[PDB]
Write a protein that binds this DNA or RNA. Structure first.
Ligand code: K
Ligand code: K
Ligand code: K
Ligand code: MG
Ligand code: MG
Ligand code: MG
Ligand code: MG
Length: 69
RNA sequence: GGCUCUGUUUACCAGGUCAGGUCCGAAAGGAAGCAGCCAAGGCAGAGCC
């Protein structure tokens, strides 16, 4: 379960936008998204880095649930 | 070394086109710009000079 799976699953638009600014490697392994990539993704999606942090957290909470359920 | 062909590789760090998202505007209209793709660069094989 990665960001591609989360992608398929104005807030929803904002969330898809952040994923749209990512490279395929970032969507496949979100853990590689550190400071520099967050900044690139944020500016590229018209968001603030804090918005990218919230999206990544939500993705993480979902991945954790899927791993279980 | 150079050029060409072919394969492959490359988040951002002055290229092009820029979906989505963003920004300015009441609108008409504009703008910046990530991903992708393209170009280009990296690593090689081959050919030519
Ligand atoms: K090549
Ligand atoms: K682009
Ligand atoms: K952009
Ligand atoms: Mg680039
Ligand atoms: Mg550009
Ligand atoms: Mg648009
Ligand atoms: Mg408006």
């Amino acid at each position: 379960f990665d960001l591609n799976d989360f992608l398929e699953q104005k807030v929803l638009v904002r969330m898809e936008a952040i994923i749209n600014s990512m490279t395929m490697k970032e969507r496949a392994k979100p853990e590689i998204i550190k400071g520099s990539r967050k900044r690139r993704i944020a500016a590229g999606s018209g968001m603030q880095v804090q918005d990218v942090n919230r999206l990544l957290k939500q993705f993480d909470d979902m991945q954790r649930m899927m791993k279980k359920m």
